[PDB]
Amino acid sequence: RRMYLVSWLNSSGVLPNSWNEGRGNRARIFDLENYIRSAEIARRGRIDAFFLADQPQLTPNPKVRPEYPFDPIVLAAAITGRVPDIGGIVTASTSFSLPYTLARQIASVNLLSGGRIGWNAVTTANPAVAANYGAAIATHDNRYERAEEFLEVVHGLWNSWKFPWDEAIGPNPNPFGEVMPINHEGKYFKVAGPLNVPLPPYGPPVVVQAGGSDQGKRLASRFGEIIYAFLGSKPAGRRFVAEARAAARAQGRPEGSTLVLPSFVPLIGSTEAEVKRLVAEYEAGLDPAEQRIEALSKQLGIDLERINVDQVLQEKDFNLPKESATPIGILKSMVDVALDEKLSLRQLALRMRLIAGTPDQVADRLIDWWQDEAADGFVINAPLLPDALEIFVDQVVPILQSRGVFPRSYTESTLRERLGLPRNPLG
Amino acid sequence: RRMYLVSWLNSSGVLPNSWNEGRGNRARIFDLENYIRSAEIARRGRIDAFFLADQPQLTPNPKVRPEYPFDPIVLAAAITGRVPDIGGIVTASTSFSLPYTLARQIASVNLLSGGRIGWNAVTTANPAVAANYGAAIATHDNRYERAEEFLEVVHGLWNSWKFPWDEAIGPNPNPFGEVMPINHEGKYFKVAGPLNVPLPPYGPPVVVQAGGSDQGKRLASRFGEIIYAFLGSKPAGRRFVAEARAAARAQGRPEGSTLVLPSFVPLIGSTEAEVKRLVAEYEAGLDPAQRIEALSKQLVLQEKDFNLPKTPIGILKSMVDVALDELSLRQLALRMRLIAGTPDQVADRLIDWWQDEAADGFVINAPLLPDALEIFVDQVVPILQSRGVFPRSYTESTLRERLGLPRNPLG
């Protein structure tokens, strides 16, 4: 067993002003070489795959870099056309996609890249997205019922053309191999098939899922092979992994069917000086930390007249509001984090946003989670691309490799095999 | 004025058994490198763009290699990520696409490649395609009604985000530039926009039209910057070109905004004798099956065999006229596609049609890829260049500027 790592690759970085950082050319998020540079950095680190989030809408907030400057399937095709080895995971919606088109486009990019592309299958709740397709958002339950049928159609399409890879030269009375339509007709979709992209011999594209709701957890137990998770408390991390594995097995899926990867933003400086400086820069890009810290203490009911912002918080210090404009589950997660990690309020305010530390501190935290099975690996969401991913790959990865928990080489050429997943995840 | 050239790049070649020819590995059509090699051959010859045909269906006819092994947008993105300079034209259907997604994918692959990607906007008549989308084929009329609304949506979307390419570094209170929804509502589509891909400083993706019907020519007069046409005879071609330029002018488009590219299949031999050898070989080639069985459906031969269905009847009867004034079905299909000769013969025919303005350029449809395109690039292109009608270098880096089209094609 070893740790898996995936690197967000969108746009200029996760921080909203990131496109004015580094060399400060906002137009680099529209340049393929901007993404080649980042993917080649991840490749040098042996990162298992890059990841592209996506929503088909523009949010032209002058203070926030656009997160989705390109269609992710197109971007992942151009990247992997150029950069070998590294996998890629692309987001596309089950709400506003045609299943035959999506099946065919993910299957094409997977096959064309040598088996390196997975699909983060999401549902759409953003009404700006739905308006670009002439629709409104469906309820939570219909979203997921549609997604479930969409995933059945897509898996059916992937399996509908089994081309004879071992009999592709010379006489063959059946050179197309096994071709079988799906003749699907359900509540949401009618699709005959077959797909015109053949199943590879190493299996279908890897399917990724992200969503903590019970309906999301159900979709994941049926179709998700990688699940992205919130980096909340380590105990809630272990709980979430155990419940993911149990839900998958309960559906009859093979053991080793599911990896859980908590996602987080590293703020890595080579020393405390640099860490303290970087944290000051990040906070100077936010409303005053005196403002932010008082905001947090109210949300958690911490009385800052009796409690210093630097003292280790205790259970008795919290008075969570019964109802609030902030979901109770978030508040309770913050309490679990503060108690599990023995934090002050000032520390908690930062820890909920990002993981600041030296390379050794980050590696120690990653290894701590990974070995206690609060994670099978992690999604690294660099605050600035490529610069902060370069720091992670140059200074954290080699620690992980010395520690014996992360590979120095690409020893599998397909994503499904690199991840140790079943060749036939549904059968 | 100079001649343009586009190379068809699908699968193993235009011929149905082409995946068994060459070195005979049928699985090469599923390998990115198969396409890299043909695109680099085309790039070495300064071909203006490769071209990808497409339909979203699989026909497992054991005699006919699969034409569409990959979604062409994905394939074009992969090729242009690896191969510089050469343009690319990808086919996607207005009948079974969502306009916002298609607008975004074409704009994305175009901008990612440095402006090298155009879109062949087509309709779908194949009932197997419609069945993969849970639908029945629409009437010809409705197909082009939907197409024309689709094209207006896509063009509005491409224009809906004008990022300030000149002010992307340093203080700017308006870093996104001009953003506007299209708020479109028509018969087929309701789309708000804006698109989340910005319009490039060099203009939107090139749009290609192929519809020969009367509704096809209307659509091309508004949106066709390239027209793929079947041109039977040189005078018919001259008339088609002159009519297409006039119809574009009438829609208020700039002068020099229209390119008409007929396609042909090259057959190149060193001697008249080898040309006969090769014409006989190709003659046994596409017999007897989606291209061949479709004209026998839309249609030695005699005046009694035909039953022209109640594509314009003019083209149909023009073909009946050619078969009667010479031809079998296996001889007529040959006649309709082939330009067979020595390198100098082939170059001369191409130059003849182009200097008389029967054509602005041509689509090269190689029987076997990459082999036959490699022959064309190695032996015909150099003749075209020394005659002075085809460039020796890539002097523009975007397809729009390479084709000499206007920066804002609508007006």
Domain ranges of chain A: 1-427
Closest Cα in chain B to A77: B78
Residues 29-48 of chain B whose Cβ lies under 8 A from any Cβ of chain A: 30, 32
- Spatial neighbors of B252 by CB under 8 A, at least 6 apart, are B411
Q: Which residue in the set A30, A70, A168 is minimally distant from B25, CB to CB? A: A168
CATH for the B1-411 domain, from 3.20.20.30, 1.10.3720.10, 3.30.70.380, 3.40.640.10: 3.20.20.30
The Cα B368–Cα B376 span in angstroms is 11
CA B328 to chain CA centroid, nearest Å: 28
A264 φ, ψ (degrees, to nearest 5): -155, 165
Beta bridge partners of A52: A90
Q: How far is B170 from chain A (nearest CA, A)?
A: 7
> Residue B54 annotated as binding?
yes
The Cα B122–Cα A74 span in angstroms is 20
Check if the beta carbon of residue B182 is closer than 8 Å to that of residue B192: yes
Helices (H), A63-122: 72-82, 99-112
CATH for the A1-427 domain, from 3.20.20.30, 3.40.50.10490, 2.120.10.80, 3.90.79.10: 3.20.20.30
The Cα B173–Cα A61 span in angstroms is 11
Record the tokens describing residue B392, joined without a space: 């020796």
Closest Cα in chain B to A182: B132
Q: How far is B71 from chain A (nearest CA, A)?
A: 6
A158 reaches B (C-beta below 8 A): no
A80 reaches B (C-beta below 8 A): yes
Record the tokens describing residue A307, joined without a space: 């409690």
Q: Which residue in the set A58, A128, A170 is minimally distant from B195, CB to CB? A: A58
The Cα B269–Cα A198 span in angstroms is 37
B176 reaches A (C-beta below 8 A): yes
**B-interface mutation test, from A132, A137, A166, most B Cβ less than 10 A away:** A132
Which one-letter DSSP state was computed for residue B284? T
> Residue B91 annotated as binding?
yes
Q: What is the CA angle B272-B275-B276, rounded to 5?
A: 95
Q: Count CA within 13 A, CB hemisphere, residue B62.
A: 9
Q: Which amino acid is at A39?
A: A
Q: Which amino acid is at A314?
A: Q
- Spatial neighbors of B138 by CB under 8 A, at least 6 apart, are B95, B146
Which one-letter DSSP state was computed for residue A169? B
How much of chain B is helix, strand and coil, in % rounded to 5? Answer: 40, 15, 45
Q: Which residue in the set B114, B131, B196 is minimally distant from A58, CB to CB? A: B196
Helices (H), B224-291: 234-250, 272-283
CA dihedral for B130, B132, B135, B136, sign (positive or negative): positive
Which one-letter DSSP state was computed for residue B94? S
Q: How far is B222 from chain A (nearest CA, A)?
A: 24
Counting other chains too, the contacts that B344-347 makes at CB distance below 8 Å and 24 or more residues apart are B344/B383, B346/B266, B346/B268, B346/B380, B347/B380, B347/B383, B347/B384, B347/B387
Angle at which helices A289-300 and A328-340 cross, to 10°? 100
Q: Which residue in the set B75, B104, B134 is minimally distant from A112, CB to CB? A: B75
Check if the beta carbon of residue B104 is closer than 8 Å to that of residue B70: no
Phi-psi map region of A349: left, alpha, beta (phi>0 left; psi -120 to 50 alpha): alpha
Chain breaks in chain B (C to N over 2.5 A) after: 289, 299, 310, 326
CB-CB neighbors (< 8 A) of B114 in chain A: 32
Beta bridge partners of B209: B227
Q: What is the CA angle A404-A408-A414, rounded to 5?
A: 115
Beta bridge partners of B362: B5
The Cα B218–Cα B144 span in angstroms is 10
Peptide bond into A99 cis (omega under 30): no
| Secondary structure (3-state) at A43 | helix
Method: X-ray
Binding-site positions of A for FMN read 54, 91, 140, 144, 213
Q: What is the resolution of this structure in A?
A: 2.1
B73 reaches A (C-beta below 8 A): yes
A120 φ, ψ (degrees, to nearest 5): -85, 105
A212 φ, ψ (degrees, to nearest 5): -80, -10
The Cα A182–Cα A190 span in angstroms is 10
């207006």: which residue's tokens? B152
The Cα A132–Cα B193 span in angstroms is 5
Looking only at Cα atoms, what is the longest distance across chain B? Answer: 77
| Secondary structure (3-state) at B259 | strand
B110 reaches A (C-beta below 8 A): no
CB burial readout B173-204, b (16+ within 10 A) else e: eebbbebebbebeeebbebbbbbbbbbbebbb
| Secondary structure (3-state) at B62 | coil
Looking only at Cα atoms, what is the longest distance across chain A? Answer: 86
